């Protein structure tokens, strides 16, 4: 689990979404297993605006942060789970490391901000869903 806290948003993965996170729904996009919801509080997370490809994630199936390269946001296709059929999921950067599937939520990080979120792993590969194009994420 984890989200992402900025402005009056809450940044989660779609599949782990509460029925508060759709009752106050600002954005959703299946493609990219995102949604975002609205917030009484003001988060202060900072958001990268970049195009680095090395950062850190937080693995919660470790407790540990890992320092890892991973791929520039593309169309990568996802086997099928309990929540969606296989499918292409866009804005997904891929890299060397260790996942499981409640680890999905964790935070990855550059020296800009935050780059985005867990969303897929197998095979020794951990996929993140992008959140630096999503500019309106800051006003
Ligand atoms: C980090 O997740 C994992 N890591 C290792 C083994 C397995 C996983 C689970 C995993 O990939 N997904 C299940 C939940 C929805 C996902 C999606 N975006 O389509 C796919
Ligand atoms: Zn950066």
Same mark, same amino acid.
């Given at each position: 689990?984890?989200?992402?806290?900025?402005?009056?948003?809450?940044?989660?993965?779609?599949?782990?979404?509460?029925?508060?996170?759709?009752?106050?729904?600002?954005?959703?996009? &299946?493609?990219?297993? #995102?949604? =975002?919801?609205?917030?009484?509080?003001?988060? +202060?997370?900072? @958001?990268? !605006? *970049?195009?680095?490809?090395?950062?850190?994630?937080?693995?919660?199936?470790?407790?540990?942060?890992?320092?890892?390269?991973?791929?520039?946001?593309?169309?990568?296709?996802?086997?099928?789970?309990?929540?969606?059929?296989?499918?292409?999921? &866009?804005?997904?950067? #891929?890299? =060397?490391?260790?996942?499981?599937?409640?680890? +999905?939520?964790? @935070?990855? !990080? *550059?020296?800009?901000?935050?780059?985005?979120?867990?969303?897929?792993?197998?095979?020794?590969?951990?996929?993140?869903?992008?959140?630096?194009?999503?500019?309106?994420?800051?006003?």
């Amino acid at each position: 689990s984890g989200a992402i806290y900025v402005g009056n948003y809450r940044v989660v993965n779609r599949h782990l979404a509460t029925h508060n996170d759709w009752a106050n729904l600002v954005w959703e996009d &299946s493609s990219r297993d #995102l949604l =975002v919801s609205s917030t009484t509080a003001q988060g +202060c997370d900072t @958001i990268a !605006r *970049c195009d680095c490809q090395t950062g850190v994630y937080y693995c919660s199936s470790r407790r540990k942060h890992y320092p890892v390269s991973f791929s520039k946001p593309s169309l990568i296709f996802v086997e099928a789970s309990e929540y969606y059929p296989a499918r292409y999921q &866009s804005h997904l950067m #891929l890299a =060397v490391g260790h996942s499981e599937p409640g680890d +999905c939520g964790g @935070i990855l !990080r *550059c020296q800009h901000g935050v780059v985005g979120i867990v969303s897929t792993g197998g095979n020794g590969l951990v996929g993140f869903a992008d959140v630096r194009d999503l500019l309106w994420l800051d006003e």
